[PDB]
Amino acid sequence: SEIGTGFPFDPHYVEVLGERMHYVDVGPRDGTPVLFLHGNPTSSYLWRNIIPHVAPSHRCIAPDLIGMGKSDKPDLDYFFDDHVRYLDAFIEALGLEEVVLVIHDWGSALGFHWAKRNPERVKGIACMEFIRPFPTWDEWPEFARETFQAFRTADVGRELIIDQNAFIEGALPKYVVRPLTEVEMDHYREPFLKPVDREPLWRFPNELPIAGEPANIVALVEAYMNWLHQSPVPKLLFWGTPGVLIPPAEAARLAESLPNCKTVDIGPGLHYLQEDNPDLIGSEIARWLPALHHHH
């Protein structure tokens, strides 16, 4: 029952756009792969206890986003658009055709954006605590409002996130219900031991589509949500209580609005649901994959 702290996955690397990206790659190579996309400030480590449920039946590919995890650290601005370029190039470098997406946070923005642009290549989407527009600050959860309003500044936000490592030392454990252990925290800390390497951790909250800003991300996210609401693709949406980005009432709304959507209550959860109930997330993804196979 204890949640595993180890990362028993051999490293793989691919060079795209001048830089090495690290990824997990396990499971059979003769089927449709399952592509796992983490968000901020995590890595493929976030999927460590989910992958073992899926690997028996399906290939599992879990990249570390550029600037994160064991991937290289170019001196980028780390805008969403930078992540889009790197992940698009990663997917093509691996020769992926059709996929199943398993996505969270900025990984969900990346995944939904890729799906909208490549709808014929997505067999299913399992999602959790995903990015949607927040049209005003009042739609953002109250207990994270002042935190994220401060993150979204050039002075205080850089001080908190880059100097003081607030995304790793603060937000990450705050948005897991159970206590993270020091071993787990050290795995999350490792990429960001050098303060200068924390740029992506600050740019990400500055890219969130909140209160109309930034306008490019608001438009992009509205576009993929419009696509999602019309798409017949099978969807599996995990949610927790109280949640952060997807509170229970919003999950229930989405169950009804999104086509061919199954919702799964994970129990207690805030944002990093994978750390509170990885076994239910993994076992439910695994159970749901076979019915996606057939092309109708």
Check: CB of residue 67 under 8 Å from CB of residue 94. Answer: no
In the complex with Cl ion, the residue whose CB is nearer, 20 or 174, is 174
Q: Answer left, alpha or beta for residue 293, where phi above 0 means left and psi between -120 and 50 means alpha.
A: alpha
Of 199, 206, 173, nearest to 188 (Cα)? 173
Residue 3 binds Cl ion (CB under 5 A) = yes
- For residues 207 to 246, the per-residue mask of contacts with Cl ion, x marking binding by CB under 5 A and - elsewhere, is ----------------------------------------
- What's the CA gap between 291 and 165, in Å, rounded? 43
Smallest distance from the beta carbon of 49 to Cl ion, in angstroms?
A: 4
Check: CB of residue 255 under 8 Å from CB of residue 237. Answer: yes
Q: Is 159 a catalytic residue?
A: no
In the complex with Cl ion, the residue whose CB is nearer, 78 or 204, is 204
In the complex with Cl ion, the residue whose CB is nearer, 234 or 243, is 243
Q: Catalytic: which of 64, 72, 129, 284?
A: 129
Q: Catalytic: which of 64, 72, 82, 105?
A: 105
Residue 6 binds Cl ion (CB under 5 A) = no
Number of residues that bind Cl ion (CB under 5 A): 6
Q: Catalytic: which of 53, 104, 187, 271?
A: 271
- For residues 191 to 210, the per-residue mask of contacts with Cl ion, x marking binding by CB under 5 A and - elsewhere, is -------------xx-----
Residue 272 binds Cl ion (CB under 5 A) = no
Residue 40 binds Cl ion (CB under 5 A) = yes
Query: Distances from the Cα of 37 to the Cαs of 84, 107, 130, 214, in angstroms?
Result: 12, 4, 11, 22
Tokens at residue 201, please? 């951790």
Residue 144 binds Cl ion (CB under 5 A) = no
Smallest distance from the beta carbon of 282 to Cl ion, in angstroms?
A: 9
- What's the CA gap between 162 and 278, in Å, rounded? 29
Q: Answer left, alpha or beta for residue 270, where phi above 0 means left and psi between -120 and 50 means alpha.
A: alpha
Q: Is 38 a catalytic residue?
A: no
Q: Answer left, alpha or beta for residue 260, where phi above 0 means left and psi between -120 and 50 means alpha.
A: left
- Give me the active site residues, please: 105, 129, 271
Name the site residues for Cl ion (rule: CB under 5 A): 3-4, 40, 49, 204-205
